[PDB]
RNA sequence: UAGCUAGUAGGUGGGGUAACGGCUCACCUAGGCGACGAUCCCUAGCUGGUCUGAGAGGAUGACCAGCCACACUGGAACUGA
RNA sequence: CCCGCAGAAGAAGCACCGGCUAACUCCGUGCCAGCAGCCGCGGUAAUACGGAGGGUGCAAGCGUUAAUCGGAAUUACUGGGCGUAAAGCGCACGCAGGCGGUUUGUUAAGUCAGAUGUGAAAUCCCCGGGCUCAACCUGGGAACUGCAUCUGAUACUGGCAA
């Protein structure tokens, strides 16, 4: 059954980048809009738009720089089978800083740079490389 | 304040005493998975008010029998 | 400034009608010493003809690598056929410390001081092919910032 | 514990002048350099990758007169120090007392400098140091004692000190026969042809 | 009895004594409550040779601790400053 | 492989037991050499291989190869077994230390001399 | 090696100890432990650490130091803080 | 520890040289004698056996053996696999277990941040100091990745209510 909708979202974006898809729709939630706002903020997607009233639908307009795709490798880190909670010192950098890692901290859903600057660790959701 | 624990009554049938299962939720040292893990404790209660299936808080005291170094403070949540 | 070097020569066989027939395969890598790495295979009936076909194929089919100061940038994993290959920039982690047939491509590639560890198969014809794939899909901070705006 | 053999043989296996017989005359002229390190020395080796790494380590040890456990300890110390392990390793080999006595022109070779150091003819900072591998700190004064001053050797050695290149990190002065190790030698200040990444990679396998 | 006493720790023919506070019936180089200074009888003729925390020593003598003859000699050497 | 399956039952690599039950894993043992043989090897090789059969000091009766050209062993001759397989003979797992208790050094040998129990010739 | 346990699990009272306590005894209740591995069997002194490892780990716990246990073998108490 | 005396005078072995693996020829032997960690050498011109010359590596040591970890991603948590190489239960139902769509409120158990107590000393690591240097000894720090308590944060997971 669906047991990880975040990894489902990242699957939608990997398979949309891999199929030269212009835009990606999915069911929407607060955590997916938080992550999507981080992805737009860090420049991996072009835009997002949440529509619907009773059944919201998140839509990510994807990016393609050259013919190549911008989101090179998006991975889900803290899956439901095994959750991964890092401190502010254990908090990893991806592609030696060239690629953010979306961590859910108590202050909100941030990146690794932003939460290492904020001085607080948390639950590391996904590597975007 | 005092250090106390919470747990549920696992069995009842003993003469002014009870036994309480505690659920500690601990990460596996090698595998990094948070796993449930119990701790059954023989707990004293004067006048045996708590029955089976309850939830009760519990503090540590002097020994009262073999094992039995624990005594309740507050019975909560008895709902059958 | 061409900086060519051969990795592996082998004797393959064919098994015709009357006995066997033995041929020699070279496998070389050239590179200028600042990106610009190529490999060539080349096979012939004697060894110097084999290495010459290998060099001649390797001088063309040469790929750009976005080096750092003298080294890689981020840790990169390249795979080819059965041969999985890790590399780590080792920001002046002195000396090229790579496996055989990976030391050579990293040596003429112009990188100086990375850390490697090939896994899986370590056939020399596929461990390069897994270093270039690898160094090819390693991108620089002016390319990632080009992609994602800033 | 030290070599004690044919020296120019060691200089002939490496293919390069290891400065092992600096002495009176000029460039070798009786070595048959490059030609035959043994009976089958006329053969080109077609040397391996282990052979080039090994042969680089042997070049450096046979220059500075160090054996393997001592060299290996220098590699461990150069590894743990902050910076560049090749350059740190040459900085540890250049701070050796017999080397600093050789660089100042007090000995003709490094073995003669090692015998000056060994035979209590050398003070550092006004204290006699008997040890070939004493590690000379920067801003030190290393000199010859009153015994073994104005002995022939050192005079002749200073005579052949002017034929060489006068290292930048020293105060060579031969009037008083005292020297000052001022700073650690930069990598660009020494020899230019040894490949220390090969010996880093040799010990890192 | 707790004793503020020396405990030999240097090499052979080169002792370095660490002054500790031990339960007196332990071994010499054994179990101690706290170490409180040191005493090097050589060290060189440089700066110290001996430093020794007088506040903690005064604390333990306030508790009831005894002091061996060397530690008393060292406190009589480092009196307040010298 | 699933992390739950490893919590239920962890990984376990086997023990990889010893080729040489010289018991306690001692460097050498001593034995009595119950008999002395020559034995034909396995198929690609042919020779007569000089091999003793030994009652060790720990009870085990094991057969043991005798190195070098020519020995002086006969049936009681207390030897010092070493450890090391001769692959060409089926079932010898050990060697005898030449130059040991009742096993003389190899006669007229000049190179690799230490591993055959022979002293340096005076010259 | 899937069942183990009758002072066994708990209670009341008496005794006992420096001190709580089935520690012990009388009586009452019929519990307690166990697949989160009891019980049985083989092995083993434990730790700070040591060796190896890029690391995570793996092996080990000679010297040095902390704790425990033993003092020909089995048992017992006496004196004494 | 310092000074003086006499004279190079008292002071170099061990393994290896077919590939892996740095370092090669001659002679003796001829499926023998024997070598060998694996591949494998030896049945007449053996760079693999035995000797010599030569060389290579280490050096008051050097080899062999035993044992451990590494290499071994060949138990894979980091970090593997399962159509045909070993590997998908013959197929289902289902308890305990593991996991669980979406919104709001509360809690704050997990999680995170800070503080305090502790995590003995030595050892490892860093910056210094003393033995002529080094090993060694030593001063100060870092570390001991932990546990407990208190103070907070509430995004995610859990509890509770809708």
Swiss-Prot record, chain B:
Listed transmembrane segments: none
Subunit-level organization: Part of the 30S ribosomal subunit.
Any further remark recorded for this protein: The strain missing both S17 and L29 grows very slowly and has a rather unstable temperature-sensitive phenotype.
A GO term for molecular function: rRNA binding
Originating species: Escherichia coli (strain K12)
Name the UniProt record assigns to this protein: Small ribosomal subunit protein uS17
Origin organism lineage: Bacteria, Pseudomonadati, Pseudomonadota, Gammaproteobacteria, Enterobacterales
Described function: One of the primary rRNA binding proteins, it binds specifically to the 5'-end of 16S ribosomal RNA. Also plays a role in translational accuracy; neamine-resistant ribosomes show reduced neamine-induced misreading in vitro.
Keywords annotated in UniProt: Antibiotic resistance, Ribonucleoprotein, Ribosomal protein, RNA-binding, rRNA-binding
Record CDD domains: Ribosomal_uS17
UniProt superkingdom: Bacteria
Curated annotation (Swiss-Prot), chain C:
Annotated InterPro entries: Ribosomal_Su5_D2-typ_SF (IPR020568), Ribosomal_uS5 (IPR000851), Ribosomal_uS5_bac-type (IPR005712), Ribosomal_uS5_C (IPR005324), Ribosomal_uS5_N (IPR013810), Ribosomal_uS5_N_CS (IPR018192), Ribsml_uS5_D2-typ_fold_subgr (IPR014721)
Upper lineage: Bacteria, Pseudomonadati, Pseudomonadota, Gammaproteobacteria, Enterobacterales
Superkingdom of the organism of origin: Bacteria
Family the entry assigns: Belongs to the universal ribosomal protein uS5 family.
This protein's UniProt keywords: Acetylation, Antibiotic resistance, Ribonucleoprotein, Ribosomal protein, RNA-binding, rRNA-binding
Protein name, UniProt field: Small ribosomal subunit protein uS5
Keyword Nucleotide-binding: no
One GO biological process term: ribosomal small subunit assembly
Organism encoding this protein: Escherichia coli (strain K12)
Function: With uS4 and uS12 plays an important role in translational accuracy. Many suppressors of streptomycin-dependent mutants of protein uS12 are found in this protein, some but not all of which decrease translational accuracy (ram, ribosomal ambiguity mutations). Located at the back of the 30S subunit body where it stabilizes the conformation of the head with respect to the body.
Additional detail: Altered uS5 proteins have been identified in a number of mutants. Some mutations in uS5 have been shown to increase translational error frequencies. Some mutants in this protein can partially suppress an alanyl-tRNA synthetase mutant.
Transmembrane spans: none
Gene giving rise to this polypeptide: rpsE
GO cellular component assignments: cytoplasm; cytosol; cytosolic small ribosomal subunit
Domain S5 DRBM per the UniProt entry, residue ranges: 2-65
This protein's record includes keyword Glycoprotein: no
Swiss-Prot record, chain D:
Transcription regulation keyword on record: yes
SUPFAM superfamilies, A to Z: Alpha-L RNA-binding motif (SSF55174)
S4 RNA-binding domain mapped to chain residues: 95-155
InterPro entries listed in its UniProt record: Ribosomal_uS4, Ribosomal_uS4_bac-type, Ribosomal_uS4_CS, Ribosomal_uS4_N, S4_RNA-bd, S4_RNA-bd_sf
Keyword Repressor found: yes
Keywords for the protein's UniProt record, in alphabetical order: Antibiotic resistance, Repressor, Ribonucleoprotein, Ribosomal protein, Ribosome biogenesis, RNA-binding, rRNA-binding, Transcription, Transcription antitermination, Transcription regulation, Transcription termination, Translation regulation
Pfam families attached to this UniProt entry: Ribosomal_S4, S4
Assembly: Part of the 30S ribosomal subunit. Contacts protein S5. With proteins S3 and S5 encircles the mRNA as it enters the ribosome, which may play a role in mRNA helicase processivity. Some nascent polypeptide chains are able to cross-link to this protein in situ. The rRNA transcription and antitermination complex (rrnTAC) consists of RNAP, NusA, NusB, NusE (rpsJ), NusG, SubB, ribosomal protein S4, DNA and precursor rRNA; S4 is more flexible than other subunits.
Cross-referenced PANTHER family: 30S 40S RIBOSOMAL PROTEIN, SMALL RIBOSOMAL SUBUNIT PROTEIN US4M
Family named by the database record: Belongs to the universal ribosomal protein uS4 family.
Protein name stated in the entry: Small ribosomal subunit protein uS4
Lineage, broadest ranks: Bacteria, Pseudomonadati, Pseudomonadota, Gammaproteobacteria, Enterobacterales
GN (gene name): rpsD
Curated annotation (Swiss-Prot), chain E:
Lineage, highest ranks first: Bacteria, Pseudomonadati, Pseudomonadota, Gammaproteobacteria, Enterobacterales
GO biological process per UniProt: cytoplasmic translation; ribosomal small subunit assembly
Induction / repression: Part of the rpsP-rimM-trmD-rplS operon.
Keyword annotations: Endonuclease, Hydrolase, Nuclease, Ribonucleoprotein, Ribosomal protein
GO MF terms held by the record: DNA endonuclease activity; four-way junction DNA binding; structural constituent of ribosome
Name of protein: Small ribosomal subunit protein bS16
Family annotation (InterPro entries): Ribosomal_bS16, Ribosomal_bS16_CS, Ribosomal_bS16_dom_sf
Family: Belongs to the bacterial ribosomal protein bS16 family.
GO cellular component: cytoplasm; cytosolic small ribosomal subunit; small ribosomal subunit
Pfam families for this protein: Ribosomal_S16
Function (record text): In addition to being a ribosomal protein, S16 also has a cation-dependent endonuclease activity.
The UniProt record lists the keyword Glycoprotein: no
Assembly description: Part of the 30S ribosomal subunit.
Keyword field contains Transferase: no
Cysteines joined through disulfide linkages: none
């Amino acid at each position: 059954s669906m047991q990880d909708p975040i990894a489902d979202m990242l699957t939608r974006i990997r398979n949309g980048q891999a199929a030269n898809k212009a835009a990606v729709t999915m069911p929407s939630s607060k955590l997916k809009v938080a992550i999507a706002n981080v992805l737009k903020e860090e420049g991996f997607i072009e835009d997002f738009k949440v529509e619907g009233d009773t059944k919201p639908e998140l839509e990510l307009t994807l990016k393609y720089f050259q013919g190549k795709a911008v989101v090179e490798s998006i991975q889900r880190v803290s899956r439901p089978g095994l959750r991964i909670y890092k401190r502010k010192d254990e908090l990893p950098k991806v592609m030696a800083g060239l690629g953010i890692a979306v961590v859910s901290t108590s202050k909100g859903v941030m990146t690794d740079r932003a939460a290492r600057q904020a001085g607080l660790g948390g639950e590391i959701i996904c590597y975007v490389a | 304040k005092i250090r106390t624990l919470q747990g549920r009554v696992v069995s009842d049938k003993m003469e002014k005493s009870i036994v309480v299962a505690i659920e500690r939720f601990v990460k596996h040292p090698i595998y990094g998975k948070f796993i449930k893990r119990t701790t059954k404790l023989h707990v004293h209660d004067e006048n045996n008010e708590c029955g089976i299936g309850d939830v009760v808080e519990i503090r540590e005291c002097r020994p009262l029998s073999k094992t039995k170094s624990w005594t309740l403070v507050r019975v909560v949540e008895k709902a059958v | 400034e061409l900086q060519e070097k051969l990795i592996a020569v082998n004797r393959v066989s064919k098994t015709v009608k009357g006995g066997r027939i033995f041929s020699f395969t070279a496998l070389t890598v050239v590179g200028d010493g600042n990106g610009r790495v190529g490999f060539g295979y080349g096979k012939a009936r004697e060894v110097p003809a084999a290495i010459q076909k290998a060099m001649e194929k390797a001088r063309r089919n040469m790929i750009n690598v976005a080096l750092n100061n003298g080294t890689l940038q981020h840790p990169v994993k390249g795979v080819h056929t059965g041969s999985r290959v890790f590399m780590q920039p080792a920001s002046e982690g002195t000396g090229i410390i790579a496996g055989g047939a990976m030391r050579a491509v990293l040596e003429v590639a112009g990188v100086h001081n990375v850390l490697a560890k090939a896994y899986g198969s370590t056939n020399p014809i596929n461990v390069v092919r897994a270093t270039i794939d690898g160094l090819e899909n390693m991108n620089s901070p002016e390319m990632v910032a080009a992609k994602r705006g800033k | 514990a030290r070599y004690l053999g044919p020296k120019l043989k060691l200089s002939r296996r490496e293919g390069t002048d290891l400065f092992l017989k600096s002495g009176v005359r000029a460039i070798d002229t009786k070595c048959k350099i490059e030609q035959a390190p043994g009976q089958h020395g006329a053969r080109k080796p077609r040397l391996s990758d282990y052979g080039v790494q090994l042969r680089e380590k042997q070049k450096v040890r046979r220059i500075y007169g160090v054996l393997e456990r001592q060299f290996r300890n220098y590699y461990k110390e150069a590894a743990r120090l902050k910076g560049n392990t090749g350059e740190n390793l040459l900085a540890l080999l250049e701070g050796r007392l017999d080397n600093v006595v050789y660089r100042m022109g007090f000995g003709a070779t490094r073995a003669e400098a090692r015998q000056l150091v060994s035979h209590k003819a050398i003070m550092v900072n006004g204290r006699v140091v008997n040890i070939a591998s004493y590690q000379v700190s920067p801003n030190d004064v290393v000199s010859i004692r009153e015994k073994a001053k104005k002995q022939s050797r050192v005079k002749a050695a200073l005579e052949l000190a002017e034929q060489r290149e006068k290292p930048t990190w020293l105060e060579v002065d031969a009037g008083k026969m005292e020297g000052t190790f001022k700073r650690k030698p930069e990598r660009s200040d020494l020899s230019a042809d040894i490949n220390e990444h090969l010996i880093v990679e040799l010990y890192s396998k | 009895m707790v004793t503020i006493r020396l405990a030999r720790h240097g090499a052979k023919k080169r002792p370095f004594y660490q002054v500790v506070v031990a339960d007196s019936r332990n071994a010499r180089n054994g179990r101690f409550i706290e170490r409180v200074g040191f005493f090097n009888p050589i060290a060189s003729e440089k700066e110290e040779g001996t430093r020794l925390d007088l506040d903690r020593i005064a604390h333990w003598v306030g508790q009831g601790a005894t002091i061996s003859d060397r530690v008393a000699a060292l406190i009589k050497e480092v009196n307040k400053a010298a | 492989a699933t992390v739950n399956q490893l919590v239920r039952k962890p990984r376990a690599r086997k023990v990889a037991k010893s080729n040489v039950p010289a018991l306690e894993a001692c460097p050498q043992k001593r034995g009595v050499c119950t008999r002395v043989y020559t034995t034909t090897p396995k198929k690609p090789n042919s020779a007569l291989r000089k091999v003793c059969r030994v009652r060790l000091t720990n009870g085990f009766e094991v057969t043991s190869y005798i190195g070098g050209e020519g020995h002086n062993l006969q049936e009681h001759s207390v030897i010092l077994i070493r450890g090391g397989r001769v692959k060409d003979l089926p079932g010898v797992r050990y060697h005898t230390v030449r130059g040991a208790l009742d096993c003389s050094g190899v006669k007229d040998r000049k190179q690799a001399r230490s591993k055959y129990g022979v002293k340096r010739p005076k010259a």
